[PDB]
Structure 1
Amino acid sequence: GAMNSSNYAELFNNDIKLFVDDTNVYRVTVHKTFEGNVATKAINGCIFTLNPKTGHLFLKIIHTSVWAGQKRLSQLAKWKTAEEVSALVRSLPKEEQPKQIIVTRKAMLDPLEVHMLDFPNIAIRPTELRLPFSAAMSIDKLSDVVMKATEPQMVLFNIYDDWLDRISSYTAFSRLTLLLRALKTNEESAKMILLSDPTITIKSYHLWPSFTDEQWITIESQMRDLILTEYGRKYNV
């Protein structure tokens, strides 16, 4: 069934599962034509497929060429997402294939289900959680590899850097979603908070700065404060 606040700890057990987020698969800019009509221009996109327990991210870069001469692109995007997730599962050795795939948007269930027909014992689940993975393109290194790509490309990352050497996956996921929530609600402020201090650098093989334990505490509070301020602003509360 659906994933929600109640059954949230199941993400951190030892059953392999992946989140799939398709929000950044089909991305456009909207502009005016010479005759004054509106047209879209596609930019490169990505499927965000994440193992929440281990932090392994499978970033499938979606090159604009895949849309060429295609109609109803927003619907195609869902089927291309499911095709690429299915191919990823097939490329994994049996003992690495997920037992569940959790789609962040319900429109992905039917396309993925149809593409996973060969894996009847992989459950495709929706979620009631309002997860911030669309903000993945606010992470500089991810946006960079997506925009520079010249062809379809899969890029692997650990989205938790090395956090798991010191904290649990539950805590890692909570940190990730807090950072991404902040980045989604006010990217400029979120990014200011992360980089304000030039003495805290990002390792070449990492996505986030090398904060000490205590610095992560100050960060996480600053992200929290950011999120609540934006809430009062949005709703005049």
Structure 2
Amino acid sequence: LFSQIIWFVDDTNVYRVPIHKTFEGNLTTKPINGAIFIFNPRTGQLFLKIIHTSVWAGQKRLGQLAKWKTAEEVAALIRSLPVEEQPKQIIVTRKGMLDPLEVHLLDFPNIVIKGSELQLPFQACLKVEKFGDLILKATEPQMVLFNLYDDWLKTISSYTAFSRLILILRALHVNNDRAKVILKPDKTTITEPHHIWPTLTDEEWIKVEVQLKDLILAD
């Protein structure tokens, strides 16, 4: 990482069907809005492609179709960017994305596509209010830009920032309530309106990061 433009692509949250049993005793099939997370680990840039439920109108094997829709949307984003902003490598968090991406990116022979064993659970972002409500309440597809490193890169490297983010996401994923406590060390801890994460000192982040690691280790 950190050397060529690299994107992580997570399709885990694209096709979302909540588990519920009706009064008649059957599983519901109604989806809710999802999203594709497309993330540059050097700069912190997130492209959030919100996927509105209308796109599923009609067809079957929607789990499988969603991998293709993800590939389509990644290709559309690439085509909308100047060549110098296009990724050289795409790393997919799930192996089901490899073939659909390969087929959708035949016009981009320069782009290397690979899988990964890295635990990078963007699904945890659905528990962060900024993202969760935006996704839920959308009435049409759209793309939203974010900076997942807030102002961190003013004082730390991309490597330190990436590690910090991964710890935050994994901790939120494994134990949301406890992670949120760890990330609010004081009553006065705040998150700026345009930031994703709390404003903490360097020293406070060291302590937070140790705690997040311990939480992940525990479960």
In 1, the alpha carbon distance for the partners of 2:118 and 2:218 equals: 22
Aligned 1:151-230 pairs, distance under 5 A:
151-195=140-184, 197-230=186-219
Candidates 40, 65, 77, aligned match of 2:66: 77
5+ unaligned residues in a row in structure 1: which ranges? 1-10, 231-237
5+ unaligned residues in a row in structure 2: which ranges? none
Cα RMSD after superposing both structures: 1.3
Deviates more, 1:118-127 or 1:48-57: 118-127
Q: TM-score, normalised by structure 2?
A: 0.96
In 2, the alpha carbon distance for the partners of 1:55 and 1:29 equals: 30
In 2, the alpha carbon distance for the partners of 1:37 and 1:229 equals: 36
Aligned 1:87-106 pairs, distance under 5 A:
87-106=76-95
8 Å Cα contact 1:22/1:47 also seen in 2: yes
Aligned to 1:139: 128
- What does the per-residue CA deviation read over 1:106-127, in whole Å, with 9 as the maximum and x for residues that have no partner? 1101001111111111111111
Aligned to 2:45: 56
Aligned 1:31-46 pairs, distance under 5 A:
31-46=20-35
Identity %: 69
Deviation at 1:129, TM superposition (A): 2.1
In 1, the alpha carbon distance for the partners of 2:29 and 2:18 equals: 6
Aligned to 2:105: 116
8 Å Cα contact 1:16/1:96 also seen in 2: yes
In 1, the alpha carbon distance for the partners of 2:57 and 2:167 equals: 37
Deviation at 1:200, TM superposition (A): 1.6
Deviation at 1:28, TM superposition (A): 1.1
Q: TM-score, normalised by structure 1?
A: 0.89
